[PDB]
Amino acid sequence: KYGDIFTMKVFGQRLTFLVGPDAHVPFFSQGDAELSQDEPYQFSVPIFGPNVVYGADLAHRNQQLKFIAASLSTKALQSYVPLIVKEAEDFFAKWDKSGTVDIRDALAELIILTASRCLMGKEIRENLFTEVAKLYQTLDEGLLPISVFFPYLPIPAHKRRDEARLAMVRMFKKIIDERRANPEVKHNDCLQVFMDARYRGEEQALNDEEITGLMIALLFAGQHTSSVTGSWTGLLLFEANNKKKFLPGVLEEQEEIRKEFGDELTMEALNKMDKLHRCVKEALRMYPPLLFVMRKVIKPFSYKDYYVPEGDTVFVSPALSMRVEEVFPNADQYNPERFVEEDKQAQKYRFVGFGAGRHGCMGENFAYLQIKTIWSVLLRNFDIELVGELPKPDYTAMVVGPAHPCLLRYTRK
Ligand code: HEM
Ligand SMILES: O[C@@](Cn1cnnn1)(c1ccc(F)cc1F)C(F)(F)c1ccc(-c2ccc(OCC(F)(F)F)cc2)cn1
């Protein structure tokens, strides 16, 4: 079991898989001239919309990615964290003195609530949430297996998808027009950043399609990644064995933070929760939400004496790569504290839950803050137990989440 590169031919296409840190090197270390995202990620274009992300040419795409990075910078996150905390506290306040919850359903709800606020702004959060959630659900239901091959197939799900997108644009057109009418009012959200964004060489702001598309993209990200890793984080920690070993260190750490900082959850406090961080990271190691990341090969390369020609699609599976024993001792065991030592390793591309290199996750820090917020609030206010077996990965959506039901029992402290 030290195969680390192999090829299928399927549908007349050569798929080449790269497993483990050495094989990863040609995937992550190269750039846009050598590897292309366009063709593998076609499926996303009619979801986010035309001329947005993988539907834009490189020139525009590279600038859109800089806008996104700005919207999720450290500075921006400082101002979002209060919002993220409030939403979480309001949400879990609604909970009874004890009961049972599907954690996956719950965190999907909370994360899309929070995202609507930070991404899309107060107006939408407070006036139009239900409309936005419904429109998103429709978008998401137009992502079928067939859609990765034929995105613009005129089947019903695709029609409703396209209609839902256009509706979403119309909704934001109103908010944007109102904001341009009153442009001296500052707003704390990604929308503001996208409204102030300008392409270079041009007095051109993004139109409403592009702005809406960038926000669909980021909403999609949170629902497809953060919400699942957020669920696993708890499912894994509050399994009886894992709970025994690891929860003490976590609860201790929360109390040490409260003594230095107080009851208030802040950027600085969350940034100190190392043991909780590693719990999230280990859930991510074991059940990464993205099955594959992919590129079309433009410039051929060899790894060992294995030749990968132009026109190949190369794949990395974070799931596979991070179950390799040579890299991760007891690969199939839950051990958060592996990352004390693992984090000190010099060799690149061992952990690839957030990808790496030029196109690594720009939302990593946001994800950690969102997920640590959730579990900080939960840990501080409840005693929690896993109901039954640890769920198995469910591969039906275009996302690998824990299979329903994902039940936790809670009792208030
Ligand atoms: C724990 C949750 C998350 C995981 C596991 C995750 C994972 C990843 C991975 C593996 C990539 C690389 C994709 C590729 O190479 O093609 C990526 C890219 C990206 N992620 Fe995330 N992500 C997460 C959360 C987020 C969040 C919350 C956002 C923002 C809303 C976000 C925004 C992005 C963006 C914009 C990229 C594009 C990188 C590029 O093409 O340059 N992610 N993410
Ligand atoms: O990488 C994403 C997802 N993401 C990244 N971070 N959080 N979510 C992405 C990238 C940039 C964004 F702005 C928003 C995004 F959501 C993405 F571009 F849409 C994306 C890329 C690849 C996949 C993907 C994952 C697994 C797949 O399985 C392969 C198979 F379907 F079997 F053929 C197929 C596709 C999903 N989303």
Side-chain angles (χ1 to χ4, degrees), residues 27 37 41 54 65 68 72 218 221-222 225-226 229 284 289-290 293 295 352-355 358-364 366-367 371:
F27 190 98
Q37 295 176 295
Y41 295 166
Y54 304 117
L65 286 172
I68 291 168
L72 302 170
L218 294 197
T225 61
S226 288
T229 298
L284 172 52
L290 293 177
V293 291
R295 307 279 182 278
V352 294
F354 291 106
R358 169 71 207 305
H359 291 289
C361 187
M362 270 179 316
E364 170 167 354
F366 175 41
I371 294 171

PDB file of all heavy atoms in Angstrom, residues 27 37 41 54 65 68 72 218 221-222 225-226 229 284 289-290 293 295 352-355 358-364 366-367 371, ligand 1:
ATOM      1  N   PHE A  27       1.355  18.996  -7.700  1.00  0.00           N
ATOM      2  CA  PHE A  27      -0.001  19.531  -7.674  1.00  0.00           C
ATOM      3  C   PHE A  27       0.011  20.934  -7.073  1.00  0.00           C
ATOM      4  O   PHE A  27      -0.561  21.854  -7.644  1.00  0.00           O
ATOM      5  CB  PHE A  27      -0.943  18.604  -6.897  1.00  0.00           C
ATOM      6  CG  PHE A  27      -2.405  18.948  -7.018  1.00  0.00           C
ATOM      7  CD1 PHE A  27      -3.220  18.272  -7.913  1.00  0.00           C
ATOM      8  CD2 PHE A  27      -2.956  19.982  -6.277  1.00  0.00           C
ATOM      9  CE1 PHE A  27      -4.549  18.631  -8.076  1.00  0.00           C
ATOM     10  CE2 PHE A  27      -4.289  20.326  -6.420  1.00  0.00           C
ATOM     11  CZ  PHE A  27      -5.086  19.647  -7.317  1.00  0.00           C
ATOM     12  N   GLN A  37      -7.673  25.410 -13.301  1.00  0.00           N
ATOM     13  CA  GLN A  37      -8.838  25.036 -12.508  1.00  0.00           C
ATOM     14  C   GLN A  37     -10.112  25.048 -13.356  1.00  0.00           C
ATOM     15  O   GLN A  37     -11.157  24.589 -12.901  1.00  0.00           O
ATOM     16  CB  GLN A  37      -9.029  25.985 -11.322  1.00  0.00           C
ATOM     17  CG  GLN A  37      -7.913  25.923 -10.292  1.00  0.00           C
ATOM     18  CD  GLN A  37      -8.093  26.939  -9.191  1.00  0.00           C
ATOM     19  OE1 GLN A  37      -8.046  28.146  -9.421  1.00  0.00           O
ATOM     20  NE2 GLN A  37      -8.294  26.460  -7.975  1.00  0.00           N
ATOM     21  N   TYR A  41     -13.732  22.539 -12.620  1.00  0.00           N
ATOM     22  CA  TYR A  41     -14.632  23.260 -11.730  1.00  0.00           C
ATOM     23  C   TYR A  41     -15.709  24.007 -12.521  1.00  0.00           C
ATOM     24  O   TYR A  41     -16.370  24.893 -11.979  1.00  0.00           O
ATOM     25  CB  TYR A  41     -13.835  24.229 -10.849  1.00  0.00           C
ATOM     26  CG  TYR A  41     -12.882  23.592  -9.868  1.00  0.00           C
ATOM     27  CD1 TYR A  41     -11.917  24.356  -9.241  1.00  0.00           C
ATOM     28  CD2 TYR A  41     -12.958  22.250  -9.533  1.00  0.00           C
ATOM     29  CE1 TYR A  41     -11.041  23.810  -8.322  1.00  0.00           C
ATOM     30  CE2 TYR A  41     -12.099  21.687  -8.600  1.00  0.00           C
ATOM     31  CZ  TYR A  41     -11.125  22.473  -8.006  1.00  0.00           C
ATOM     32  OH  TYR A  41     -10.237  21.968  -7.088  1.00  0.00           O
ATOM     33  N   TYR A  54     -14.525  30.795 -11.400  1.00  0.00           N
ATOM     34  CA  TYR A  54     -13.993  29.888 -12.408  1.00  0.00           C
ATOM     35  C   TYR A  54     -14.705  30.133 -13.738  1.00  0.00           C
ATOM     36  O   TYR A  54     -14.319  29.560 -14.755  1.00  0.00           O
ATOM     37  CB  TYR A  54     -14.074  28.427 -11.953  1.00  0.00           C
ATOM     38  CG  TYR A  54     -13.387  28.169 -10.639  1.00  0.00           C
ATOM     39  CD1 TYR A  54     -14.098  27.735  -9.533  1.00  0.00           C
ATOM     40  CD2 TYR A  54     -12.059  28.499 -10.453  1.00  0.00           C
ATOM     41  CE1 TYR A  54     -13.508  27.624  -8.281  1.00  0.00           C
ATOM     42  CE2 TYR A  54     -11.446  28.378  -9.215  1.00  0.00           C
ATOM     43  CZ  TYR A  54     -12.174  27.951  -8.120  1.00  0.00           C
ATOM     44  OH  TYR A  54     -11.547  27.852  -6.887  1.00  0.00           O
ATOM     45  N   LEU A  65     -10.256  37.162  -6.498  1.00  0.00           N
ATOM     46  CA  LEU A  65      -9.711  36.397  -5.393  1.00  0.00           C
ATOM     47  C   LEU A  65      -9.057  37.331  -4.376  1.00  0.00           C
ATOM     48  O   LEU A  65      -9.036  37.033  -3.181  1.00  0.00           O
ATOM     49  CB  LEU A  65      -8.708  35.377  -5.936  1.00  0.00           C
ATOM     50  CG  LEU A  65      -9.329  34.179  -6.655  1.00  0.00           C
ATOM     51  CD1 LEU A  65      -8.261  33.323  -7.333  1.00  0.00           C
ATOM     52  CD2 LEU A  65     -10.145  33.338  -5.685  1.00  0.00           C
ATOM     53  N   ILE A  68     -11.837  38.795  -2.384  1.00  0.00           N
ATOM     54  CA  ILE A  68     -12.301  37.814  -1.411  1.00  0.00           C
ATOM     55  C   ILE A  68     -11.332  37.787  -0.237  1.00  0.00           C
ATOM     56  O   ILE A  68     -11.747  37.836   0.920  1.00  0.00           O
ATOM     57  CB  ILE A  68     -12.489  36.424  -2.054  1.00  0.00           C
ATOM     58  CG1 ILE A  68     -13.678  36.432  -3.018  1.00  0.00           C
ATOM     59  CG2 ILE A  68     -12.653  35.350  -0.991  1.00  0.00           C
ATOM     60  CD1 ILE A  68     -13.772  35.228  -3.907  1.00  0.00           C
ATOM     61  N   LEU A  72     -11.936  38.679   3.873  1.00  0.00           N
ATOM     62  CA  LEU A  72     -11.716  37.671   4.904  1.00  0.00           C
ATOM     63  C   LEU A  72     -10.355  37.857   5.582  1.00  0.00           C
ATOM     64  O   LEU A  72      -9.834  36.928   6.197  1.00  0.00           O
ATOM     65  CB  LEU A  72     -11.776  36.268   4.287  1.00  0.00           C
ATOM     66  CG  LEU A  72     -13.072  35.893   3.573  1.00  0.00           C
ATOM     67  CD1 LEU A  72     -12.880  34.593   2.803  1.00  0.00           C
ATOM     68  CD2 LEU A  72     -14.230  35.781   4.554  1.00  0.00           C
ATOM     69  N   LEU A 218     -19.181  32.405  -1.501  1.00  0.00           N
ATOM     70  CA  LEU A 218     -18.719  32.340  -0.120  1.00  0.00           C
ATOM     71  C   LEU A 218     -19.774  31.682   0.774  1.00  0.00           C
ATOM     72  O   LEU A 218     -19.451  31.051   1.777  1.00  0.00           O
ATOM     73  CB  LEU A 218     -18.411  33.758   0.367  1.00  0.00           C
ATOM     74  CG  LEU A 218     -17.234  34.462  -0.312  1.00  0.00           C
ATOM     75  CD1 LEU A 218     -16.763  35.650   0.514  1.00  0.00           C
ATOM     76  CD2 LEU A 218     -16.062  33.522  -0.541  1.00  0.00           C
ATOM     77  N   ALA A 221     -19.332  28.029   0.103  1.00  0.00           N
ATOM     78  CA  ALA A 221     -18.153  27.528   0.797  1.00  0.00           C
ATOM     79  C   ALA A 221     -18.517  27.101   2.214  1.00  0.00           C
ATOM     80  O   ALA A 221     -18.179  25.994   2.641  1.00  0.00           O
ATOM     81  CB  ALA A 221     -17.071  28.576   0.816  1.00  0.00           C
ATOM     82  N   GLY A 222     -19.148  28.012   2.960  1.00  0.00           N
ATOM     83  CA  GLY A 222     -19.465  27.763   4.358  1.00  0.00           C
ATOM     84  C   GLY A 222     -20.369  26.545   4.526  1.00  0.00           C
ATOM     85  O   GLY A 222     -20.170  25.751   5.442  1.00  0.00           O
ATOM     86  N   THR A 225     -18.297  23.204   3.606  1.00  0.00           N
ATOM     87  CA  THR A 225     -17.084  22.829   4.317  1.00  0.00           C
ATOM     88  C   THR A 225     -17.252  23.045   5.817  1.00  0.00           C
ATOM     89  O   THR A 225     -17.097  22.115   6.603  1.00  0.00           O
ATOM     90  CB  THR A 225     -15.863  23.574   3.753  1.00  0.00           C
ATOM     91  OG1 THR A 225     -16.043  24.987   3.907  1.00  0.00           O
ATOM     92  CG2 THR A 225     -15.622  23.267   2.290  1.00  0.00           C
ATOM     93  N   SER A 226     -17.426  24.306   6.220  1.00  0.00           N
ATOM     94  CA  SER A 226     -17.411  24.679   7.622  1.00  0.00           C
ATOM     95  C   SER A 226     -18.480  23.899   8.383  1.00  0.00           C
ATOM     96  O   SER A 226     -18.217  23.395   9.472  1.00  0.00           O
ATOM     97  CB  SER A 226     -17.603  26.167   7.774  1.00  0.00           C
ATOM     98  OG  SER A 226     -16.441  26.876   7.355  1.00  0.00           O
ATOM     99  N   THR A 229     -17.321  20.112   8.835  1.00  0.00           N
ATOM    100  CA  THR A 229     -16.200  19.980   9.752  1.00  0.00           C
ATOM    101  C   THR A 229     -16.621  20.415  11.154  1.00  0.00           C
ATOM    102  O   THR A 229     -16.094  19.912  12.145  1.00  0.00           O
ATOM    103  CB  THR A 229     -14.981  20.759   9.237  1.00  0.00           C
ATOM    104  OG1 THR A 229     -14.632  20.169   7.982  1.00  0.00           O
ATOM    105  CG2 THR A 229     -13.792  20.719  10.171  1.00  0.00           C
ATOM    106  N   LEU A 284     -10.890  17.533  10.729  1.00  0.00           N
ATOM    107  CA  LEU A 284     -10.669  17.874   9.335  1.00  0.00           C
ATOM    108  C   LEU A 284      -9.729  16.848   8.699  1.00  0.00           C
ATOM    109  O   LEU A 284      -9.962  16.397   7.578  1.00  0.00           O
ATOM    110  CB  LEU A 284     -10.107  19.299   9.258  1.00  0.00           C
ATOM    111  CG  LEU A 284      -9.636  19.757   7.877  1.00  0.00           C
ATOM    112  CD1 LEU A 284     -10.714  19.532   6.829  1.00  0.00           C
ATOM    113  CD2 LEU A 284      -9.234  21.220   7.909  1.00  0.00           C
ATOM    114  N   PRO A 289     -14.064  17.647   4.052  1.00  0.00           N
ATOM    115  CA  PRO A 289     -15.340  17.810   3.350  1.00  0.00           C
ATOM    116  C   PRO A 289     -15.255  17.788   1.826  1.00  0.00           C
ATOM    117  O   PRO A 289     -16.247  17.524   1.147  1.00  0.00           O
ATOM    118  CB  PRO A 289     -15.869  19.179   3.806  1.00  0.00           C
ATOM    119  CG  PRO A 289     -14.655  19.902   4.359  1.00  0.00           C
ATOM    120  CD  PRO A 289     -13.696  18.828   4.846  1.00  0.00           C
ATOM    121  N   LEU A 290     -14.105  18.191   1.282  1.00  0.00           N
ATOM    122  CA  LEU A 290     -13.890  18.129  -0.154  1.00  0.00           C
ATOM    123  C   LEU A 290     -13.175  16.822  -0.472  1.00  0.00           C
ATOM    124  O   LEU A 290     -12.045  16.623  -0.038  1.00  0.00           O
ATOM    125  CB  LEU A 290     -13.034  19.314  -0.606  1.00  0.00           C
ATOM    126  CG  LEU A 290     -13.665  20.697  -0.484  1.00  0.00           C
ATOM    127  CD1 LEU A 290     -12.668  21.759  -0.905  1.00  0.00           C
ATOM    128  CD2 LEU A 290     -14.929  20.792  -1.320  1.00  0.00           C
ATOM    129  N   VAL A 293      -9.515  17.803  -4.803  1.00  0.00           N
ATOM    130  CA  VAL A 293      -9.216  19.008  -5.549  1.00  0.00           C
ATOM    131  C   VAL A 293      -8.539  18.585  -6.852  1.00  0.00           C
ATOM    132  O   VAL A 293      -7.985  17.494  -6.923  1.00  0.00           O
ATOM    133  CB  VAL A 293      -8.345  19.954  -4.700  1.00  0.00           C
ATOM    134  CG1 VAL A 293      -9.135  20.529  -3.534  1.00  0.00           C
ATOM    135  CG2 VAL A 293      -7.090  19.276  -4.178  1.00  0.00           C
ATOM    136  N   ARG A 295      -6.953  19.667 -11.046  1.00  0.00           N
ATOM    137  CA  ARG A 295      -6.428  20.583 -12.047  1.00  0.00           C
ATOM    138  C   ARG A 295      -6.361  19.860 -13.391  1.00  0.00           C
ATOM    139  O   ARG A 295      -6.190  18.648 -13.440  1.00  0.00           O
ATOM    140  CB  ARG A 295      -5.025  21.076 -11.670  1.00  0.00           C
ATOM    141  CG  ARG A 295      -4.893  21.672 -10.277  1.00  0.00           C
ATOM    142  CD  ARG A 295      -5.340  23.124 -10.164  1.00  0.00           C
ATOM    143  NE  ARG A 295      -5.170  23.679  -8.825  1.00  0.00           N
ATOM    144  CZ  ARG A 295      -6.018  23.505  -7.812  1.00  0.00           C
ATOM    145  NH1 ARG A 295      -7.229  23.017  -8.035  1.00  0.00           N
ATOM    146  NH2 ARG A 295      -5.673  23.902  -6.592  1.00  0.00           N
ATOM    147  N   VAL A 352      -3.369  18.610   4.146  1.00  0.00           N
ATOM    148  CA  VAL A 352      -3.879  19.282   2.965  1.00  0.00           C
ATOM    149  C   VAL A 352      -5.399  19.430   3.043  1.00  0.00           C
ATOM    150  O   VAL A 352      -6.063  19.582   2.019  1.00  0.00           O
ATOM    151  CB  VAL A 352      -3.457  18.546   1.685  1.00  0.00           C
ATOM    152  CG1 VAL A 352      -1.949  18.608   1.485  1.00  0.00           C
ATOM    153  CG2 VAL A 352      -3.939  17.106   1.672  1.00  0.00           C
ATOM    154  N   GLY A 353      -5.930  19.552   4.266  1.00  0.00           N
ATOM    155  CA  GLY A 353      -7.355  19.768   4.450  1.00  0.00           C
ATOM    156  C   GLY A 353      -7.817  21.111   3.888  1.00  0.00           C
ATOM    157  O   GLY A 353      -8.962  21.235   3.437  1.00  0.00           O
ATOM    158  N   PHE A 354      -6.925  22.111   3.934  1.00  0.00           N
ATOM    159  CA  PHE A 354      -7.214  23.419   3.365  1.00  0.00           C
ATOM    160  C   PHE A 354      -6.433  23.636   2.072  1.00  0.00           C
ATOM    161  O   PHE A 354      -6.227  24.782   1.653  1.00  0.00           O
ATOM    162  CB  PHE A 354      -6.852  24.536   4.342  1.00  0.00           C
ATOM    163  CG  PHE A 354      -7.732  24.601   5.560  1.00  0.00           C
ATOM    164  CD1 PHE A 354      -7.267  24.171   6.788  1.00  0.00           C
ATOM    165  CD2 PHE A 354      -9.030  25.080   5.473  1.00  0.00           C
ATOM    166  CE1 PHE A 354      -8.088  24.216   7.907  1.00  0.00           C
ATOM    167  CE2 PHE A 354      -9.837  25.146   6.598  1.00  0.00           C
ATOM    168  CZ  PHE A 354      -9.370  24.696   7.809  1.00  0.00           C
ATOM    169  N   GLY A 355      -6.075  22.539   1.397  1.00  0.00           N
ATOM    170  CA  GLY A 355      -5.238  22.667   0.218  1.00  0.00           C
ATOM    171  C   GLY A 355      -3.882  23.257   0.599  1.00  0.00           C
ATOM    172  O   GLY A 355      -3.474  23.170   1.754  1.00  0.00           O
ATOM    173  N   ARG A 358      -0.687  28.185  -4.202  1.00  0.00           N
ATOM    174  CA  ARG A 358      -1.272  29.379  -4.785  1.00  0.00           C
ATOM    175  C   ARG A 358      -2.770  29.460  -4.475  1.00  0.00           C
ATOM    176  O   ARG A 358      -3.304  30.556  -4.299  1.00  0.00           O
ATOM    177  CB  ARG A 358      -0.986  29.366  -6.295  1.00  0.00           C
ATOM    178  CG  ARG A 358      -1.738  30.411  -7.110  1.00  0.00           C
ATOM    179  CD  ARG A 358      -1.223  31.824  -6.864  1.00  0.00           C
ATOM    180  NE  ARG A 358      -2.253  32.834  -7.084  1.00  0.00           N
ATOM    181  CZ  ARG A 358      -2.946  32.965  -8.209  1.00  0.00           C
ATOM    182  NH1 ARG A 358      -2.567  32.310  -9.294  1.00  0.00           N
ATOM    183  NH2 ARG A 358      -4.007  33.752  -8.243  1.00  0.00           N
ATOM    184  N   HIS A 359      -3.469  28.318  -4.473  1.00  0.00           N
ATOM    185  CA  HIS A 359      -4.922  28.331  -4.372  1.00  0.00           C
ATOM    186  C   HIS A 359      -5.382  27.655  -3.080  1.00  0.00           C
ATOM    187  O   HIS A 359      -6.510  27.179  -2.990  1.00  0.00           O
ATOM    188  CB  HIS A 359      -5.567  27.678  -5.599  1.00  0.00           C
ATOM    189  CG  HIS A 359      -5.404  28.464  -6.859  1.00  0.00           C
ATOM    190  ND1 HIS A 359      -6.064  29.650  -7.104  1.00  0.00           N
ATOM    191  CD2 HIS A 359      -4.698  28.196  -7.963  1.00  0.00           C
ATOM    192  CE1 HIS A 359      -5.740  30.086  -8.310  1.00  0.00           C
ATOM    193  NE2 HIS A 359      -4.902  29.222  -8.845  1.00  0.00           N
ATOM    194  N   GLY A 360      -4.562  27.753  -2.046  1.00  0.00           N
ATOM    195  CA  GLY A 360      -5.017  27.288  -0.733  1.00  0.00           C
ATOM    196  C   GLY A 360      -6.207  28.092  -0.212  1.00  0.00           C
ATOM    197  O   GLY A 360      -6.441  29.191  -0.719  1.00  0.00           O
ATOM    198  N   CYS A 361      -6.899  27.569   0.791  1.00  0.00           N
ATOM    199  CA  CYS A 361      -8.143  28.192   1.318  1.00  0.00           C
ATOM    200  C   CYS A 361      -7.903  29.595   1.883  1.00  0.00           C
ATOM    201  O   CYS A 361      -7.124  29.748   2.831  1.00  0.00           O
ATOM    202  CB  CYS A 361      -8.837  27.307   2.356  1.00  0.00           C
ATOM    203  SG  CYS A 361     -10.452  27.892   2.905  1.00  0.00           S
ATOM    204  N   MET A 362      -8.625  30.547   1.311  1.00  0.00           N
ATOM    205  CA  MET A 362      -8.578  31.937   1.805  1.00  0.00           C
ATOM    206  C   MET A 362      -9.520  32.061   3.014  1.00  0.00           C
ATOM    207  O   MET A 362      -9.441  33.081   3.684  1.00  0.00           O
ATOM    208  CB  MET A 362      -9.018  32.869   0.676  1.00  0.00           C
ATOM    209  CG  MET A 362      -7.879  33.343  -0.205  1.00  0.00           C
ATOM    210  SD  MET A 362      -8.360  34.435  -1.570  1.00  0.00           S
ATOM    211  CE  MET A 362      -9.812  33.602  -2.196  1.00  0.00           C
ATOM    212  N   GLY A 363     -10.333  31.037   3.282  1.00  0.00           N
ATOM    213  CA  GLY A 363     -11.335  31.081   4.359  1.00  0.00           C
ATOM    214  C   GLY A 363     -10.926  30.280   5.573  1.00  0.00           C
ATOM    215  O   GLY A 363     -11.769  30.087   6.436  1.00  0.00           O
ATOM    216  N   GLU A 364      -9.663  29.864   5.627  1.00  0.00           N
ATOM    217  CA  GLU A 364      -9.213  29.008   6.707  1.00  0.00           C
ATOM    218  C   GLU A 364      -9.475  29.673   8.062  1.00  0.00           C
ATOM    219  O   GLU A 364     -10.002  29.048   8.974  1.00  0.00           O
ATOM    220  CB  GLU A 364      -7.737  28.677   6.493  1.00  0.00           C
ATOM    221  CG  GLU A 364      -7.094  27.990   7.680  1.00  0.00           C
ATOM    222  CD  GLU A 364      -5.731  27.369   7.419  1.00  0.00           C
ATOM    223  OE1 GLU A 364      -5.296  27.367   6.241  1.00  0.00           O
ATOM    224  OE2 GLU A 364      -5.129  26.841   8.390  1.00  0.00           O
ATOM    225  N   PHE A 366     -11.334  32.227   8.981  1.00  0.00           N
ATOM    226  CA  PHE A 366     -12.755  32.419   9.225  1.00  0.00           C
ATOM    227  C   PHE A 366     -13.378  31.116   9.730  1.00  0.00           C
ATOM    228  O   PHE A 366     -14.153  31.115  10.690  1.00  0.00           O
ATOM    229  CB  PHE A 366     -13.421  32.964   7.959  1.00  0.00           C
ATOM    230  CG  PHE A 366     -14.923  33.105   8.031  1.00  0.00           C
ATOM    231  CD1 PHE A 366     -15.535  33.577   9.179  1.00  0.00           C
ATOM    232  CD2 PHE A 366     -15.720  32.806   6.938  1.00  0.00           C
ATOM    233  CE1 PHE A 366     -16.910  33.734   9.241  1.00  0.00           C
ATOM    234  CE2 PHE A 366     -17.100  32.920   7.015  1.00  0.00           C
ATOM    235  CZ  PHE A 366     -17.693  33.369   8.173  1.00  0.00           C
ATOM    236  N   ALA A 367     -13.018  29.997   9.088  1.00  0.00           N
ATOM    237  CA  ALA A 367     -13.604  28.708   9.419  1.00  0.00           C
ATOM    238  C   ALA A 367     -13.265  28.343  10.861  1.00  0.00           C
ATOM    239  O   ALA A 367     -14.138  27.922  11.612  1.00  0.00           O
ATOM    240  CB  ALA A 367     -13.124  27.643   8.466  1.00  0.00           C
ATOM    241  N   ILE A 371     -15.899  27.933  13.938  1.00  0.00           N
ATOM    242  CA  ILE A 371     -16.139  26.601  14.475  1.00  0.00           C
ATOM    243  C   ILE A 371     -15.731  26.580  15.944  1.00  0.00           C
ATOM    244  O   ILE A 371     -16.407  25.984  16.772  1.00  0.00           O
ATOM    245  CB  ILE A 371     -15.411  25.512  13.663  1.00  0.00           C
ATOM    246  CG1 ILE A 371     -15.968  25.402  12.240  1.00  0.00           C
ATOM    247  CG2 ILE A 371     -15.480  24.174  14.384  1.00  0.00           C
ATOM    248  CD1 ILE A 371     -15.165  24.506  11.323  1.00  0.00           C
TER     249      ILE A 371
HETATM  250  C1  HEM B   1     -13.113  23.928   7.308  1.00  0.00           C
HETATM  251  C2  HEM B   1     -13.729  24.423   6.243  1.00  0.00           C
HETATM  252  C3  HEM B   1     -13.025  24.619   4.968  1.00  0.00           C
HETATM  253  C4  HEM B   1     -12.264  23.723   4.290  1.00  0.00           C
HETATM  254  C5  HEM B   1     -11.933  22.318   4.696  1.00  0.00           C
HETATM  255  C6  HEM B   1     -11.814  24.362   3.110  1.00  0.00           C
HETATM  256  C7  HEM B   1     -10.993  23.719   2.190  1.00  0.00           C
HETATM  257  C8  HEM B   1     -10.517  24.325   1.055  1.00  0.00           C
HETATM  258  C9  HEM B   1      -9.646  23.735   0.131  1.00  0.00           C
HETATM  259  C10 HEM B   1      -9.087  22.346   0.210  1.00  0.00           C
HETATM  260  C11 HEM B   1      -9.406  24.645  -0.838  1.00  0.00           C
HETATM  261  C12 HEM B   1      -8.530  24.440  -2.039  1.00  0.00           C
HETATM  262  C13 HEM B   1      -9.401  24.207  -3.275  1.00  0.00           C
HETATM  263  C14 HEM B   1      -8.547  23.945  -4.482  1.00  0.00           C
HETATM  264  O1  HEM B   1      -7.321  23.791  -4.370  1.00  0.00           O
HETATM  265  O2  HEM B   1      -9.067  23.870  -5.608  1.00  0.00           O
HETATM  266  C15 HEM B   1     -10.122  25.807  -0.522  1.00  0.00           C
HETATM  267  C16 HEM B   1     -10.130  26.940  -1.291  1.00  0.00           C
HETATM  268  C17 HEM B   1     -10.902  28.040  -0.972  1.00  0.00           C
HETATM  269  N1  HEM B   1     -11.674  28.216   0.116  1.00  0.00           N
HETATM  270 FE1  HEM B   1     -11.911  26.983   1.506  1.00  0.00          FE
HETATM  271  N2  HEM B   1     -12.292  25.607   3.059  1.00  0.00           N
HETATM  272  C18 HEM B   1     -13.031  25.840   4.144  1.00  0.00           C
HETATM  273  C19 HEM B   1     -13.729  26.984   4.517  1.00  0.00           C
HETATM  274  C20 HEM B   1     -13.822  28.114   3.727  1.00  0.00           C
HETATM  275  C21 HEM B   1     -14.570  29.258   4.029  1.00  0.00           C
HETATM  276  C22 HEM B   1     -15.399  29.477   5.264  1.00  0.00           C
HETATM  277  C23 HEM B   1     -14.394  30.144   2.988  1.00  0.00           C
HETATM  278  C24 HEM B   1     -14.991  31.483   2.878  1.00  0.00           C
HETATM  279  C25 HEM B   1     -16.304  31.661   2.962  1.00  0.00           C
HETATM  280  C26 HEM B   1     -13.539  29.514   2.044  1.00  0.00           C
HETATM  281  C27 HEM B   1     -13.115  30.072   0.873  1.00  0.00           C
HETATM  282  C28 HEM B   1     -12.238  29.423   0.005  1.00  0.00           C
HETATM  283  C29 HEM B   1     -11.815  30.075  -1.231  1.00  0.00           C
HETATM  284  C30 HEM B   1     -12.221  31.438  -1.716  1.00  0.00           C
HETATM  285  C31 HEM B   1     -10.979  29.226  -1.836  1.00  0.00           C
HETATM  286  C32 HEM B   1     -10.328  29.472  -3.167  1.00  0.00           C
HETATM  287  C33 HEM B   1      -8.820  29.298  -3.195  1.00  0.00           C
HETATM  288  C34 HEM B   1      -8.360  29.627  -4.591  1.00  0.00           C
HETATM  289  O3  HEM B   1      -8.889  29.094  -5.591  1.00  0.00           O
HETATM  290  O4  HEM B   1      -7.433  30.443  -4.755  1.00  0.00           O
HETATM  291  N3  HEM B   1     -13.215  28.281   2.523  1.00  0.00           N
HETATM  292  N4  HEM B   1     -10.805  25.596   0.645  1.00  0.00           N
END
